[PDB]
């Protein structure tokens, strides 16, 4: 429940 994790492909 963390909104600042990398939201893009290939993190």
């Amino acid at each position, epitope marked *: 429940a963390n*909104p600042n994790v990398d*939201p*893009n492909a*290939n993190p």
Partner: antibody, heavy 127, light 107 residues
Framework: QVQLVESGGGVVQPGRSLRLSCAAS????????MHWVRQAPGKGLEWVAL????????YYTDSVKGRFTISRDNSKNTLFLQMNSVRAEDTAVYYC????????????????????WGQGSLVTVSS | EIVLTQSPATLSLSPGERATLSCRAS??????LAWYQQKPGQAPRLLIF???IRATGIPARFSGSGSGTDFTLTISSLEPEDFAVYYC????????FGQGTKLEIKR
């Protein structure tokens, strides 16, 4: 060649619904997280919502949680914001923005910034 | 929430001059800070991210510095396309923006 073209704004009466569209071109839409950020007239920028590249995770600012829904259709390169139960204070220019995914020479990744933006779609909520 | 406070509210300068803009965070954001430029009627434009990294296509006269709670955007020689409102933004904890500094044309 990155382009984000918004549509769907206009005048909506309070309590009604409105759907914003953000059509992407010139980049691989389906590998980027996407955001909505809004700017009330004469005010600053307020982050609204985020959706992961694959549509799995979605996050919202508290004042829209339970009323706005973010979604995407990667097959149509389009990002959506469904705005339900709108309030006067939702009046703003709404921007879609790409999550800025950056990788340095040694492979370290950065994200969480807004590197390309739509032109803005004005939503006026008024009776 | 992390509150970003920008100063001064308005900077009145002439082309060629160095512009120094400050952004203060209510608590540490490490280096998770960005600067934007916005002109009337237009979308914001990313200038600097991770506190000091210049975005692609941004002129070298823009530079960012700082860490923790105190950040600075410097324009080494202001040019006419630089008169605009500047915002800082953090991504350490959710996403918040400063209230903006207007860089206006002195006369």
């Amino acid at each position: 060649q990155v382009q984000l073209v918004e549509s769907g704004g206009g005048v909506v009466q309070p309590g009604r619904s409105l759907r914003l569209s953000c059509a992407a071109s010139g980049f691989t839409f389906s590998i980027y997280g996407m955001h909505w950020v809004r700017q009330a007239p004469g005010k600053g920028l307020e982050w609204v919502a985020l959706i992961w590249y694959d549509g799995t995770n979605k996050y919202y600012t508290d004042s829209v949680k339970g009323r706005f829904t973010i979604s995407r259709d990667n097959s149509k390169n389009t990002l959506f914001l469904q705005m339900n139960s709108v309030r006067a204070e939702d009046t703003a220019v709404y921007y879609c923005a790409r999550d800025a995914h950056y990788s340095d020479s040694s492979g370290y990744s950065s994200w969480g910034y807004f590197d390309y933006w739509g032109q803005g779609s004005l939503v006026t909520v008024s009776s | 929430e992390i509150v970003l406070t920008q100063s001064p509210a308005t900077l009145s300068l002439s082309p060629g001059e160095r512009a120094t803009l400050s952004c203060r965070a209510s608590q540490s954001v490490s280096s998770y800070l960005a600067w934007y430029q916005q002109k009337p009627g237009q979308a914001p434009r990313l200038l600097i991210f991770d506190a000091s990294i210049r975005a692609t296509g941004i002129p070298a006269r823009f530079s960012g510095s700082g860490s923790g709670t105190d950040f600075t955007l410097t324009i080494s020689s202001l040019e006419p396309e630089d008169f605009a409102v500047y915002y800082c933004q953090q991504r350490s904890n959710w996403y918040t923006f400063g209230q903006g500094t207007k860089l206006e044309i002195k006369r």
